[PDB]
Amino acid sequence: VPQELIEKIKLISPGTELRKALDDIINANFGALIFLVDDPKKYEDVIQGGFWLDTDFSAEKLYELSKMNGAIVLSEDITKIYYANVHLVPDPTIPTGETGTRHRTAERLAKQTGKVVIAVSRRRNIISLYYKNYKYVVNQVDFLISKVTQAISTLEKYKDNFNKLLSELEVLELENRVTLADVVRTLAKGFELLRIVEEIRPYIVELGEEGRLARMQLRELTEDVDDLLVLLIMDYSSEEVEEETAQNILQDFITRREPSPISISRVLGYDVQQAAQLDDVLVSARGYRLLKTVARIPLSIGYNVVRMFKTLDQISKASVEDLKKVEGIGEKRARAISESISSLKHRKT
Template sequence: MAPGTPLRDGLDRILAGHTGALVVLGSNAELEAISTGGFAIDVPFSAPALRELAKMDGAIVLSEDGERILAAAVHLSPAASLPTGETGTRHRTAERVARQVGLPTVTVSASMSTISLFTGGPRVVVPRSDELVARAAQALAGIGVHRERLTASLARLTDLEVHDAVTLRDLAHVGQRFEMTNRLADEASTYVAALGVDGRLPALQLRDLIDDLTPLGSLVQRDYVPDDAEAMPFSGLTRLDDQELFDIVLVGRALGFGSDLHLDSPIRPRGLRQLAAVPRLAAGVSARLVGAFGDLPGIAAASHADLMAVDGLTEPAARTLRDTLAHLGAHTAD
């Protein structure tokens, strides 16, 4: 059904020709039991053939994989007792057929210029390609805006971490930005998927915007996850609806910290996010540094001799670590 597929090409041709159609995607014994008339053709599928067959009354039956046209001009008689919210003859028949035989059924409406899909539930109107492109572009623009706000929130968090001044409120703001960006990314992904081959460029743009967010978000959460927590702090934010996500108090509570903490309660980072940015630091050394000194302020205050006592930390890496943290402190002070 996505733009660029042969089936969608055929449906768009029918729509452009201002005719209607009823197409069943697949065949089974239940469909045959309610089918009369028409003629079997069993030929390879092509968009022009679908367009020409739609000029006749009756339904068109395709193979389940959409590779062949099995029959055309078929009269379908689903049970009239099946519930339907549709009023048009074609749509009413399509909904009942989908409910009765369990096969996806597609209608093309000439009067409303729409393509609709029935899968056993309410009708789903298939968006036009230009509508999907517009929605995807809007979602990508929104992600860009929230990405900038997230970057600003992370920069502020870094400044507060260096000066040992982070509060639960500050972490809540960062978590809020991550969740908003992720929700927009999920929405954009549905539009990109629906665009099919036309979604290649938006897909690349989406990937460029969000590819680094998962590892970055993981580092932030590992920095602040409570010792007795069963899940990462940001996981609780998925339970908030869009309106609740704008309430920083609810966001702070959803992070899973103890009830004795309020938004202005101080919390300390372990320092994993900052250590990940230190060049020449071998894998596993960051965790050992946190284990040895407890948190970022402890690591920053450690002497050279104390750092060298950490297993796996080389002399050059220790100097780089101290220089990086000192530069970070000087940069944020500026």
């Protein structure tokens, strides 16, 4: 959905005065047909009759005028009302898929002029926005909130299972018994969780001001999942992987490819041909996830720790003195790394 169209959709999103007027208009079962132009006298050929108003916009003015027959003409920034009660006469030969004079008009005029045209039929409660060759249906808030509330509830469940996989993996990681299946299983759930966020995003945008709470909820639920999945990819890919590449992996399984077990492992660099093989492939975390997340070591410095000790298992055996020999590890980072690991080994294993 092009950014160009999204800007226009904002014009009629909950919170704006225009949308507040359309809401009333929908509720009164008036229809509406609204033409958005900045230079009215250039569109003189497609606007016939009606009254020339040239007055400052308000929701209540628009509502009142919509009681009259025909169409309304506003400025593109919704600051002026230019015409009311007009007859819009776009070229009849422009192809249209719409039904009814109102919507067929809106589409043809939108195509003819490159401007926004808004149509509301008298008995339906949707707002149809036409821009160029685009058509976007904007839904009522109760409909959007229902989908979003379900989507969030769905996310809670994915997120709970992600947490349970993660904490199981944590244990395996600290005991160096991780198989590729555990890794892939965790990544896949994380991927799916983030896909859901991607799918619900348009509804949330569409909700405008009424989606503030929903955004906070998605934020709380997913706030560090992406960074976590990036560090998992860096800890378990077959060949060393820069952060940027790991993020591109994440981005791939969120959008382009489908997060299937075999596919994820293949992208991680493992020549596998069947899911049952994943349980036999032993792997060891390099230690980035633990070093960044728990020891608060910046990734830049993380690499230096890994280049030296290669795996988390070795890092967990290093003395403070050993760890200080790494570039970037003073006495505090050294004890942060060593105590955070021994603390986790004690508590979790």
